[PDB]
């Protein structure tokens, strides 16, 4: 429609699972690319604590699904930097058991890694899920200050890249000092402008995101009016889109990166050759992978 001027189908251009070049021997490649996603990532999660010698602390920032699993190696100092991952799933699915592919190589490079969970729609309106996420940001800074670690990196995939993007507009929580602690913000294949997808029964069935004409501003990072930009000048921001996403996905990332840059943040856009929306996460469990080396390079 808008981010894809060649568009025919929107229910296809808003489900990344259709733009994969993988599983093409299959009648429904999309179902295949999800089955695979769910399976391998759960495998990655069990392997962390059953074969990799990594330790996990089970914490929470709130009731029920509002959990933080903190992964570390005991051979490494407790004042290690902290890497925070915010998972995807269209605000309707995905959980901790599928969110920990990224942990292993980072722990092996000397990070502590916090992998968080959140409540889904429609248990919350997206709008509420977002005030809950604000509580998680307060919790994670409260927690790092406790351990007097003063270097953090945040990464969010997909709907989690969208949820993460509020860190730049919650200054009553994220002080200038807190901002100063952040080395990088990484936004993997997110959505930033919800205006289109809001009116779809395939993405938003029976309006479970609880959106409407009045809160569309609020839930669209694309549309905000950024202030107090200079306090983020120590933080590098990387908006990433995968080569084989939807065209809509890719351009949203590209424009968000532009919005960010024009407003004067240190942001860049990347189009990541060979990846789709999903294997771009799957492969974070492999230290040698392309995406791994990308995260490594952010450090210099
Ligand atoms: Na540190």
């Amino acid at each position: 429609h808008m981010y894809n001027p060649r568009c025919k189908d929107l229910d296809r251009d808003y489900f990344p699972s259709y733009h994969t070049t993988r599983f093409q021997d299959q009648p429904e490649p999309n179902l295949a690319v999800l089955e695979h996603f769910v399976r391998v990532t759960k495998q990655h999660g069990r392997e962390l604590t059953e074969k990799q010698g990594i330790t996990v602390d089970h914490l929470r920032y709130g009731e029920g699904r509002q959990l933080v699993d903190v992964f570390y190696s005991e051979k490494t100092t407790n004042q290690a930097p902290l890497f925070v991952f915010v998972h995807g799933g269209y605000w309707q699915e995905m959980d901790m058991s599928m969110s920990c592919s990224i942990v292993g190589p980072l722990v092996r490079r000397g990070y502590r890694v916090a992998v968080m969970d959140y409540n889904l729609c429609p248990q919350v309106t997206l709008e509420q899920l977002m005030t809950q996420f604000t509580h998680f940001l307060n919790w994670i800074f409260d927690y790092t200050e406790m351990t007097k670690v003063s270097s953090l990196t945040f990464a969010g995939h997909s709907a989690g890249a969208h949820l993460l993007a509020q860190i730049l507009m919650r200054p009553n929580v994220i002080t200038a000092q807190r901002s100063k602690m952040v080395w990088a913000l990484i936004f993997l294949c997110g959505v930033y402008d919800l205006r289109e997808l809001s009116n779809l029964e395939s993405v938003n069935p029976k309006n479970i995101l609880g959106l409407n004409e009045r809160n569309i501003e609020s839930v669209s990072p694309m549309l905000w009016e950024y202030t107090d930009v200079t306090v983020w000048n120590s933080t590098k921001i990387y908006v990433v889109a995968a080569e084989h996403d939807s065209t809509t996905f890719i351009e949203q990332s590209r424009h968000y990166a532009d919005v960010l840059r024009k407003k004067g943040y240190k942001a860049s856009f990347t189009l990541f050759k060979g990846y789709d929306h999903f294997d771009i996460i799957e492969e974070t469990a492999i230290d040698d992978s392309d995406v791994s080396r990308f995260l490594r390079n952010i450090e210099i």
Side-chain angles (χ1 to χ4, degrees):
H1 202 81
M2 180 192 184
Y3 295 98
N4 177 7
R6 279 173 65 98
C7 204
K8 326 141 150 300
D9 208 341
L10 295 215
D11 301 27
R12 276 191 79 273
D13 230 39
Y14 270 103
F15 283 89
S17 50
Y18 289 85
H19 302 76
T20 188
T21 72
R22 267 182 308 164
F23 294 91
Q24 289 309 111
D25 59 330
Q26 279 270 25
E28 290 193 287
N30 47 291
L31 269 33
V33 77
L34 298 161
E35 204 228 290
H36 185 271
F37 189 65
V38 176
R39 186 176 73 253
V40 315
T41 64
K42 281 165 168 300
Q43 215 180 281
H44 294 164
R46 284 184 62 113
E47 281 163 0
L48 279 174
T49 60
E50 288 180 26
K51 307 289 301 162
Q52 293 178 20
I54 291 152
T55 302
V56 69
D57 274 15
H58 293 300
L59 308 174
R60 59 177 61 260
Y61 60 101
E63 266 107 38
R65 274 176 69 98
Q66 293 183 96
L67 298 148
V68 188
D69 275 357
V70 182
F71 291 99
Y72 56 107
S73 147
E74 263 191 303
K75 290 252 289 90
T76 298
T77 168
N78 196 143
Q79 10 293 341
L82 182 92
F83 191 109
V84 183
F85 179 70
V86 181
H87 77 69
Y90 253 143
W91 318 276
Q92 302 182 52
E93 59 180 326
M94 280 347 230
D95 62 39
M96 194 83 80
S97 76
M98 323 167 209
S99 294
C100 308
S101 295
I102 199 172
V103 173
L106 292 178
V107 183
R108 282 182 289 281
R109 298 209 274 274
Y111 289 84
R112 289 192 171 211
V113 184
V115 181
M116 62 95 60
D117 211 336
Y118 49 85
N119 295 300
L120 309 174
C121 304
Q123 298 41 247
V124 225
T125 89
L126 169 57
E127 214 181 355
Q128 286 158 346
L129 160 60
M130 275 170 65
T131 38
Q132 302 187 350
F133 188 80
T134 303
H135 297 147
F136 159 75
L137 288 177
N138 188 37
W139 187 101
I140 202 83
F141 280 99
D142 270 0
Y143 178 83
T144 65
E145 303 166 355
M146 253 290 149
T147 170
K148 303 152 166 49
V149 150
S150 330
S151 8
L152 291 89
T153 285
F154 290 82
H157 180 232
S158 218
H162 156 267
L163 282 180
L164 175 50
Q166 64 169 246
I167 202 174
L168 307 167
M169 289 302 302
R170 292 302 176 271
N172 288 337
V173 170
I174 308 296
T175 53
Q177 187 47 239
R178 275 157 168 220
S179 293
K180 195 82 165 144
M181 280 177 311
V182 188
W183 168 270
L185 294 186
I186 315 175
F187 292 98
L188 297 127
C189 330
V191 295
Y192 313 93
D193 176 294
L194 302 212
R195 269 168 335 161
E196 256 157 32
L197 76 76
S198 90
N199 308 112
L200 225 192
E201 235 69 18
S202 79
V203 163
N204 195 22
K206 296 297 180 305
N207 191 19
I208 50 154
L209 313 189
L211 301 177
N212 80 84
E213 28 168 55
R214 182 200 176 283
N215 59 6
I216 200 62
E217 253 297 336
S218 283
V219 301
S220 296
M222 202 79 81
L223 317 185
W224 302 334
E225 60 195 15
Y226 298 84
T227 41
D228 229 9
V229 178
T230 67
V231 304
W232 290 102
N233 279 342
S234 276
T235 305
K236 309 183 302 171
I237 297 168
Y238 296 87
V239 187
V240 177
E243 196 193 57
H244 299 120
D245 250 324
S246 89
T247 286
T248 305
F249 270 77
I250 308 174
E251 291 298 298
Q252 284 223 26
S253 284
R254 185 188 310 278
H255 279 228
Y256 192 52
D258 196 271
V259 189
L260 292 192
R261 176 58 168 72
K262 265 205 62 87
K263 287 278 179 153
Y265 290 95
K266 312 201 304 147
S268 65
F269 174 72
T270 302
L271 182 68
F272 219 128
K273 258 198 89 70
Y275 288 116
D276 58 54
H277 209 79
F278 301 83
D279 64 345
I280 209 190
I281 294 297
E282 312 181 331
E283 289 219 324
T284 60
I286 322 283
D287 313 55
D288 193 36
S289 85
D290 262 18
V291 56
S292 285
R293 296 151 77 241
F294 183 78
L295 302 164
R296 216 350 224 240
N297 305 341
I298 289 182
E299 297 166 21
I300 52 85

